[PDB]
């Protein structure tokens, strides 16, 4: 027996400590074939556009169009207002606006008290 | 790297891997060779003992243990070869590396310069585009219904053929161009 | 002043009398000329002004940009001759119309004697520029980015004539000079509470103020290379340039009133260079980062000091440049690849040496590298917030380090690392381009050997 | 760098010093196209081991599912010189 | 008339001609290597001259000959100091240079872009150059920015490797961390002191304040690679060997223990920003050589060495010894410029293989590299009479007889035995055991330049440290009277040092293996701190920065405030507006309603 | 284990094919075809164009231009010990106290 290694969120379990990958069954074999089976059709698919002499641009990449998209237009469509979106919009975009003007106006409120009082002594202050 | 992936790994592959690894941490551990040469000698000892076993569940439970002691000494520093993908020179010349289609967009004064190599690259043009037309249908033909099973291409069959998908594998740049 | 407005206007007759294969050619030497004369601008005095006439004056305020708006033009016709190739003739002369008649609009605003006429002139630079996105726009959003631009414009805008009609019914001038000899302190009421609102919204919603820059990433991403250009260089500019000029009536109220609109850009730059290092897209990154950069300079002239003014005209001179050089390098790179997407076309300094060289050099000066302006406007902005507040040093730091993060970032994802595999149609650059990047980035290192032109009037 | 271009001669000549120095292996057995298994009667770990020595003699490393199916010298020199771009 | 000022000038001018050439013919040929190092060695043998002359007399000059800008009261001008510090540092700095650059004529021989790197290293040297002898802050700044420039250009140098792009964009990340601090200084003394120059602020800063203070030992601790932001230093060993042995080895790496000394007027003054400076110099230190004793890639540990050295320097500098830690940073140049150099001899001679567990038997198999590395190693572990004793013995010493704390001494001296130790560490495992490379020998040194530029540093740290100490003035009060084991602990924690490494190594040959304990595994993990604040902090700032600043905020709430909620209303507006049947009964009858409300609502 | 013949037969016609291009990469002994076309000793002229012609044009520009302002070049001044006398005014330093000397 030895120390047992527990993943995080920023160090992931390796691959060869997987309990998963020791329990096979005939679905998981099926599976991993499929798998490497519509692998195997994207490759074709790619190599074919690929390798052609006639082609003279960019193959285009039906993925990468999605993910822009996905990531970019069509967040708002599928946005739905809910206690956790109110929430965390109200906190991350309020609070810090908040927290700032706080900390500000109270730093400029002791800096003109102390000059109405004088005693800051702002010799040499010339430039502003 | 070259040859295609299969499915999923069996257990004598994994075992095999395990093996390359323990030796090769191993090594890296016992700096001297004398002392690595004990030090390996002793694992395969240690390795081959239950070469024999014949039931499935109790070598699927050994590997594990195996496994699992492994990452536990597995000296987080190994050694690693200059060009490995962990080596301190692994993509050092991959700047180097520029397509052969650029040659294509040079200027008539450049193509002036050596007039061999691009007569030598026009023939090579006119193989391609033969041979990529028989490759299309021989491709066709040879596939199976419903799409690819694996990764893997059939070589020519025929005389005047050439192998399907090889401008881009016979045409690599090189390994340090410059 | 008429020296420049005549042969800007005489630009319209000689494009439209021009040979179909000669119109290019014509505008650019006719541009470049003009642009020579505005130099005699600069020259300007310690004194009031340059006071031209009873309805233009000039002044070190307006000078630069004058000669920044003279000096675009020709740089936005070597961009646009690319992708107008397979357009008739009629078609490119209204385009190259729409041009001379926005750098006229502008021309006649940044002089503006009186405050009426510079609304009227600050709203008619909207139509070509409307124009210009809705019409020779490549994707189906530039429609829905034309309405937010005009929609978020016109609704800032509209109380400010208001205001402006309001405040001269009061005073009985509007004349700036008139304005600046008899100004008046405002009482902390509810009333100039509101105009004090009316007056400032209008250019704090085309600085883009944080939370009102929503229309500046679709109108900059759908926009054409040339509008691109004029947006970031001169039209976000027009914002800055009424703030300086209307900060005067708005004393002692300024003193409280700036706080909400403080917090805002201090917090939003922040926010938009966070932004700037998760984008897919090379314009919208470019767009925040102009965001960021506008909101320091609203920043600047809140602060209202000799410094904060200083800092601002030579962040706004610097930042003009440089988005206008980022966004021709990004469109340079669209031309070829036609998807306007970072990871696609990588490794490209083994292609495009001298391009990279471009790269480089743009992305150092959008950093802010000493000693070049951007740093000086940088600097003295950041000494004036101190001054202000020892407090706004944390939140101008971390500014500082996410800039110079993403503009890396930038560099590093489309220059370095490997080409992509299946890109094949990446011809060599062409000498337009070359020199479209060498006459931006040039008058930048020349004018840091000059900076005192750029640092306004408060020098 | 002053490296000299290692030729397929040379490749073959050290392939060949390496198995002969390995004990196992009878020097006079082994030929070029001998195969590992049923020519010369080797375990798969000790393929794996041939595989390693291969890998410290030419200094560079080649990945497991390359290596797995080595199986006779001359492969072993036909994949090296791939790897390196040897001419002749 | 004073040729001082026309030599000092004519140094920094000529150092910049072969820029200009940079488009010129000789840009395009192979001469150009040839055409750099030798305009190095003319400035050298240039530079030589000012400083004969301050050794003479101590000649002080400050040269403002053009004015840029004035901005109300304040006048920025271009300013050069060319006091003790500058005309003592620029022969060091090029001597290494033209040392550096004549390695470099070997090393770099087969790459194709030899002159682009040759071009970089003297606009690095430009650089330093400006920054050494700058007499203002925004002149200094310039410097400082122009250094990391080039060290994010030259870190990077092969741009197709991704880990080198990593650590050049790790390196500007730190170095703007500091930036941060030297933006607050700068701020700070131009709104109080009303000046960026130099004479001013010491006149007008009779007691300052810890504000400034703290904002140069913040940009000190981001350019010195302190503990808080150490991890760039050794992860900036990606690029090429002459690189490491110029920039991130003895030239670069000291301009933030530098800025400290040009301000170490103020810094006497005040006794909170002292004592932070020396904790963080000792824990610099401590970390850095822990980090070392372990390693197996020989440019990490000589990196960790030179962070370890920076560390003490900063000690120094906390101590209260300003000039001391100048004489230190002349003398570590020259032998750490030296051990780099013999590092890379030994990589290029192994077919560019670093790691240590792979060399073996060097002693006699190349014997010049092996005596450099000897005398080096001697050097850096203080050895009597030798370049590095008229500095870090005269370091402990102070250390030992000053009112300071208990632990930040025993930190340095624990860091002098680990010196000692991984010094031992490279020696045994890198010249004395079997072989263990690749059979096929290519070991070469026969190399007339290689054996030059390695030997004129090897002249420099034998007698540079005699020389240089023999020919200044004194300028601190010397520790005369000392009790005896006082005296040699300096010696005796060396010694130890020796014969523990030495002891620990010999164990490996024994025909025993156990797995690592918990220390060794924290000590060669860097302390985990890589690990942990590569991880952590930099996925929490991303992830916020496409959740909420992108998505929740932007594309999502100020989206709904103003213009879809503008846009539903008016839509929902015009619906029912305009959902009218055209029935003239109920036009009617609305227009009867309203007719009766006119009549008695308005009157 | 070991390659299919299938995958034998692809990997000999692909390495013949890479040889075959690996080959037709050399250069023959013209193939560089330049077109010409034009329109102690190294060091001393290197000593002349590289340090005396600059250390010309800054002493000029030191001694009559940089100087012509006041402050500019500012030296620090040198020190005086007793003993020593000055040429501008020819006076002596009086010496020190004869302090008691021993060991
Ligand atoms: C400009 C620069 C930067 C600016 C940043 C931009 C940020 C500005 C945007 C900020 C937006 C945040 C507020 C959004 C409005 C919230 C309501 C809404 O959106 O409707 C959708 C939605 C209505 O849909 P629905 O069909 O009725 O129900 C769907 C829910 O799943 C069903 O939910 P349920 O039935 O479970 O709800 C029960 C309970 C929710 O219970 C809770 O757990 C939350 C209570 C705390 O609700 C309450 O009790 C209300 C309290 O409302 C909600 O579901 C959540 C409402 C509760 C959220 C609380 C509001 C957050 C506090 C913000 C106020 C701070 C400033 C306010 C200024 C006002 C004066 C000027
Ligand atoms: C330091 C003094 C220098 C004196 C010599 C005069 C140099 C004249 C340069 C004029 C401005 C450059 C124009 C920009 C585009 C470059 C054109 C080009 O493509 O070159 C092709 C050409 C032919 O090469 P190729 O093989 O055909 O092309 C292959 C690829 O392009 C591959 O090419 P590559 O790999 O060689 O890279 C191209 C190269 C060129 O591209 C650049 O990045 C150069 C521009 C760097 C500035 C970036 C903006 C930062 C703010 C600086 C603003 C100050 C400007 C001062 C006034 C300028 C007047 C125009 O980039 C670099 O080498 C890295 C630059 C990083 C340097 C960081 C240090 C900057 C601050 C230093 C302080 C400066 C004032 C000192 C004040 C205190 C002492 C008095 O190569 C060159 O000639 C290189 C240009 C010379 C290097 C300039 C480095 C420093 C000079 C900065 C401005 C002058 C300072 C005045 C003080 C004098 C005392
Ligand atoms: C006042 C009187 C003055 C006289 C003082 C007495 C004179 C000397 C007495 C001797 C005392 C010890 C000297 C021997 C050093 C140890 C060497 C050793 O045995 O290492 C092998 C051994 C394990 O080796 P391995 O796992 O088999 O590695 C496999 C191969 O060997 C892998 O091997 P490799 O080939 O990969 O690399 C070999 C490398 C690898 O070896 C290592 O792993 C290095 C780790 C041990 C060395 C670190 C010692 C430095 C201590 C600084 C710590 C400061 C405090 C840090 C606080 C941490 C907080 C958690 O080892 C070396 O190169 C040599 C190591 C250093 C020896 C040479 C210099 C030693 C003399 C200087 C030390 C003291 C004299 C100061 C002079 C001034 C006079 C006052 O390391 C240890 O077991 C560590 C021993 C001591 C560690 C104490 C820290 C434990 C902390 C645990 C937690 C405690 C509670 C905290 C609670 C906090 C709550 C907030
Ligand atoms: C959305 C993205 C950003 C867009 C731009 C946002 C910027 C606009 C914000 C406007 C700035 C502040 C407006 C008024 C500031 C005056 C100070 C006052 O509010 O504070 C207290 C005022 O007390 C209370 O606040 C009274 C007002 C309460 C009603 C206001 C609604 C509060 C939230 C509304 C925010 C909505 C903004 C968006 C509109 C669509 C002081 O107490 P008091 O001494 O008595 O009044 C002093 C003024 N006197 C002398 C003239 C009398
Ligand atoms: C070259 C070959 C030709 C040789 C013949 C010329 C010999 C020297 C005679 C030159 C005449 C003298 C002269 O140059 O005039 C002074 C003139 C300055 O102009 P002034 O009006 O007098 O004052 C400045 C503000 N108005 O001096 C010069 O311009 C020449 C030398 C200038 C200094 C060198 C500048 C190099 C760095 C460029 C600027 C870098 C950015 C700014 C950094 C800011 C640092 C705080
Ligand atoms: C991006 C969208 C931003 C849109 C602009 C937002 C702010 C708009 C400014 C307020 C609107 C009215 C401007 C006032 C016009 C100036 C005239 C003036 O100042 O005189 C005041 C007039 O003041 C008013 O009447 C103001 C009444 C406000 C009615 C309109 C409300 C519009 C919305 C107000 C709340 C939102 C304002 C801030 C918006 C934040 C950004 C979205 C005094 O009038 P007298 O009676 O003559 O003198 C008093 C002594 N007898
Ligand atoms: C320094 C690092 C730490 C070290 C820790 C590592 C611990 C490893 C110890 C585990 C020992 C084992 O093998 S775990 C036992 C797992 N089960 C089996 O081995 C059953 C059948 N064996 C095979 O099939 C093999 O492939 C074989 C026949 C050997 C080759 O075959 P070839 O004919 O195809 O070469």
Redesign the pocket.
Known sequence: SFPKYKPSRLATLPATLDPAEYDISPETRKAQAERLAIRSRLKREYLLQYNDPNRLGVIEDPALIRWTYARSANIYPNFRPTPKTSLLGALFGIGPLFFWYYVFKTDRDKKEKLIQEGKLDQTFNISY | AFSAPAAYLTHQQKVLRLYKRALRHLESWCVHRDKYRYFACLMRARFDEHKNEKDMVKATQLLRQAEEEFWYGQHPQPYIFPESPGGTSYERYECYKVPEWCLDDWHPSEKAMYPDYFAKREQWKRLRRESWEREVKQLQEETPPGGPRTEALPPARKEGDLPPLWWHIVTRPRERPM | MLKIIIPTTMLLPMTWMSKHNMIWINATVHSLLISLISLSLLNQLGENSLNFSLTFFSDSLSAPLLVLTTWLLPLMLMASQSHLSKETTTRKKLYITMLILLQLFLIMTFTATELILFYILFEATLVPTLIIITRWGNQTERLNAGLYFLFYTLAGSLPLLVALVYIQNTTGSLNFLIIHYWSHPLSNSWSNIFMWLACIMAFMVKMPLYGLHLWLPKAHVEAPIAGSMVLAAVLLKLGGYGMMRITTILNPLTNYMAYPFLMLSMWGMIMTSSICLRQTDLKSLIAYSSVSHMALVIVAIMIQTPWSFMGATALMIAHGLTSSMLFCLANTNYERVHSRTMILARGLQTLL??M???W??AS??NLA????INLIGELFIITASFSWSNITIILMGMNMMITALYSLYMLITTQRGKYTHHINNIKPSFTRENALM?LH??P???L??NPKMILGPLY | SDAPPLTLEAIKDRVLYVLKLYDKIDPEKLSVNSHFMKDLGLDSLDQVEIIMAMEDEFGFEIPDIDAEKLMCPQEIVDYIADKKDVYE | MNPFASLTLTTLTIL?IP??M??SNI?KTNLYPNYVKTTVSYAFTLSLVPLLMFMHTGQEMIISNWHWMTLQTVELS?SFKMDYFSVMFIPVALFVTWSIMEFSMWYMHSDPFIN?FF??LL?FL??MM?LVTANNLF?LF??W??VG??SF?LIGWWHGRTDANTAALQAILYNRIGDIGFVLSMAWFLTHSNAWDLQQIFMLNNECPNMPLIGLLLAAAGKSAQFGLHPWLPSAMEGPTPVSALLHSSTMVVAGVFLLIRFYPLMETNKLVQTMTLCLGAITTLFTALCAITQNDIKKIVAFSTSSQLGLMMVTIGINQPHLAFLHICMHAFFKAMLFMCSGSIIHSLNDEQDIRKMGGLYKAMPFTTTALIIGSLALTGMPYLTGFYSKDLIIEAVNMSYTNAWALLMTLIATSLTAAYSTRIIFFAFLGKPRFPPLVLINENNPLLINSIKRLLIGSIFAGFIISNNIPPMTVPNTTMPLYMKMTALIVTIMGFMLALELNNTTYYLKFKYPSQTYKFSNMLGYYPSIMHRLPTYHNLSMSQKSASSLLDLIWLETILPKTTSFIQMKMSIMVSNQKGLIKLYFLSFLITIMISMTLFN | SGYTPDEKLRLQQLRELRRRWLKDQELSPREPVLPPRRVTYRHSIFAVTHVLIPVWIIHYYLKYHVTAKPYTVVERKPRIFPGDTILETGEVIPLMKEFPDQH
């Open positions: 040496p001298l990279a060289t471009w480089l050099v150092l000066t590298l000493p000693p070049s060498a980035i040039l930048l290192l020349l840091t050997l | 910049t820029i200009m940079s488009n840009y271009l682009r071009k970089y606009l430009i650089t400006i002149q310039i410097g920015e122009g420039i080039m250009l």
